[PDB]
Amino acid sequence: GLMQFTLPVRLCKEIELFHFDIGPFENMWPGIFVYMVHRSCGTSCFELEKLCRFIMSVKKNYRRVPYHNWKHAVTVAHCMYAILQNNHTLFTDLERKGLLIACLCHDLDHRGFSNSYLQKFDHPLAALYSTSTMEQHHFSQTVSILQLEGHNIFSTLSSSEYEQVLEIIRKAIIATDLALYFGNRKQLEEMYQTGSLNLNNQSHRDRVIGLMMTACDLCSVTKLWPVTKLTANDIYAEFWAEGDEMKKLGIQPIPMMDRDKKDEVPQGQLGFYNAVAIPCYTTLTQILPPTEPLLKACRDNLSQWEKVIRGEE
Ligand SMILES: Cc1ccc(Nc2cc(C)ncn2)cc1
Ligand SMILES: [Mg+2]
Ligand SMILES: [Zn+2]
């Protein structure tokens, strides 16, 4: 109980900021995650031995793909930590517990392919889950790991608290399906603007947690430019491989996924910032003012992509 995780001074300070990069030392990422649980939740939220065994089973079930990997899981969990730490009184005990775990598990066993490619390939998972195919699989993998012996980190919860936290995790993980984000954000925009947004309404909380999950999942676009730019290479490495697999099925991929159309990447990033990222962080900042730094960083990176197009870099 008296065993705190501490980080080196530079990490201890920078981990509190939204734009923190977890670094290239894979063996420090479990300790970074536990440090965040302990400060975000409490040293008592989880049995350290069960938590450590849960983390290492989660790690083992992420694959060696360029982007949707163990580093992404921990990066997405850090963005949730930053949001929760800047919005101390807004979230229940169960939510803080559930949401950091949801973020760590949100892409479990990702193969580097979109829901679209699974459907066109006719992957078995596509027959098992018609919509949010990979996200229903990620939640399934999470429950599977929670049921390994010595891995049930929620064992101290009551029967009703247990069902509540697994429901928080399920909705949070499903919400990382970008196809569901567009309608969710529009509904939240309308509710904020007409003044009907009510955080005591459970349906409303669910929507706000969904937007937080999109915000954390996209948080590559809220880092300092050198991080954002290098992460884009990993993102497009997956997209281009999916494009190659589309061509093998006899289907011309969308230009975003076609490695023959790399020249179009700068303009594709503009579309993505304007259609997805900026709208996402704008609505989030309206609902949770202390997340403005995510919007500010996203805007700075849009301006950097505009400079790439103008040949200034
Ligand atoms: C499946 C998936 C969806 C969105 C992202 N984030 C992105 C996307 C793009 C186009 N540019 C930068 N970041 C990554 C993966
Ligand atoms: Mg995902
Ligand atoms: Zn993700």
CA-nearest residue for atom 3, ligand 1, is: 178
Q: What is the 147 CA–ligand 3 centroid distance (Å)? A: 23
Tell me the two tokens of residue 33: 């995650």
**In this structure, what are the phi and psi dihedrals at residue 21, rounded to the nearest 5 degrees?**
-105, 130
Q: Say what the resolution is, in angstroms.
A: 2.0
Q: What is the 239 CA–ligand 1 centroid distance (Å)? A: 9
Residue 15 lies in a domain: no
Q: What is the 218 CA–ligand 1 centroid distance (Å)? A: 7
Residue 22 lies in a domain: no
Which ligand neighbours the alpha carbon of 272 most closely?
Answer: 1
Pocket test for ligand 1, best of 230, 233, 236, 272 (most atoms within 8 A of CB): 272
Give the integer Cα–Cα distance in Å for 122 and 133: 12
Determination approach:
X-ray
Cα–Cα nearest to 82, from 277, 219, 278, 226: 219
Residue 38 lies in a domain: yes
CB burial readout 287-313, b (16+ within 10 A) else e: bbeebbbbbebbbbbbebbeeeeeeee
Domain count, the chain: 1
**Segments forming the whole domain that contains residue 267:** 28-310
Ligand 1 pocket, residues with Cβ under 6 angstroms: 114, 178, 218, 220-221, 232, 235, 268-269, 272
Q: Which residues, at least 6 apart from 4, have a Cβ–Cβ distance to it below 8 Å?
A: 38, 43
> Which of 19, 38, 68, 137 is flagged as catalytic?
68
CA-nearest residue for atom 4, ligand 1, is: 218
Residue 265 lies in a domain: yes
- How many alpha carbons fall within 13 Å on the CB side of residue 96? 24
CATH code of residue 113: 1.10.1300.10
Whether 110 is catalytic is no
Residue 5 lies in a domain: no
